[PDB]
Write a protein that binds this ligand. Structure first.
Ligand code: NA
Length: 266
């Protein structure tokens, strides 16, 4: 019946210490050994998902990474990228100048590294630590990044980010979307980002239907994929609307709710 499992990371696959429990690891490895393919889908850049994909041996089982909320779809075994929704290059200098004039740090990604002019900003380091990515500091952001980039973050105290968000929202209407993922992270992304849309594209490519998919998540940004999946699973720690939209409610992330759901469903 089911042929694909899609997992969010934070609040879902990982526990409160941001680790994959050995129960979740062994259950996910076993289900792949039985022929089920996995997808890790998250707002993180690709290399913030890579270590978890490696732990789950996804590079041996044709696993997919949907990084940047599905802005990229990458087969982690073949390394082939199927889908690339990235920022228009012309917006990047505008984002940089906005950060500069507001005395806030901007960062973006270049493979396994975060690129920024302020490696000593605690908010920049928070993004590096969550993703386990080294920081490459530069004194010339716009010349040292590699374009195109899938997103940038402007980071700082929430109070300082709100007006920057409110300005960029309208200034770059039609070119980007803006939202805060943590109070201190302003995400600057292309239009049309949605895990469910990217999943749809993935399914069309690998010849699966939505009825054949299990998707597991916890947050509002998981709602569309939980609705889209034939078997949408809310974590025990999920938001109430996500629970109401699900087909199945599992244990919390700290109680191995991912392993539990997979064992129960299969
Ligand atoms: Na989450």
């Amino acid at each position: 019946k089911y042929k694909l499992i899609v997992l969010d990371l934070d609040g879902t696959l990982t526990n409160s210490k941001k680790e994959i429990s050995s129960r979740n690891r062994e259950t996910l490895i076993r289900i792949q050994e039985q022929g089920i393919r996995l997808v890790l889908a998250s707002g993180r850049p690709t290399y913030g998902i890579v270590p978890l994909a490696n732990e789950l041996r996804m590079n041996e089982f044709g696993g997919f990474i949907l990084s940047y909320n599905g802005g990229e779809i990458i087969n982690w075994e073949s390394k082939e990228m199927m889908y690339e929704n990235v920022l228009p290059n012309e917006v990047v200098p505008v984002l940089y100048e906005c950060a500069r004039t507001n005395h806030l740090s901007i960062l973006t990604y270049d493979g396994a590294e975060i690129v920024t002019e302020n490696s000593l900003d605690p908010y920049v380091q928070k993004e590096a630590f969550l993703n386990k990515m080294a920081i490459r500091e530069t004194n010339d952001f716009l010349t040292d990044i590699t374009l195109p980039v899938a997103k940038c973050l402007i980071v700082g105290d929430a109070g300082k980010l709100i007006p920057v968000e409110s300005e960029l929202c309208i200034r770059l209407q039609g070119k980007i979307n803006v939202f805060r993922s943590e109070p201190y992270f302003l995400e600057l992304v292309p239009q049309g980002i949605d895990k469910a849309l990217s999943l749809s594209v993935l399914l069309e490519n690998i010849g699966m239907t939505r009825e054949e998919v299990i998707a597991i998540g916890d947050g509002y940004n998981d709602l569309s994929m939980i609705k889209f999946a034939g078997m949408g699973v809310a974590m025990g720690n999920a938001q109430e609307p996500v629970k109401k939209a699900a087909d199945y409610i599992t244990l919390t992330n700290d109680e191995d709710g991912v392993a539990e759901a997979i064992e129960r469903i299969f």
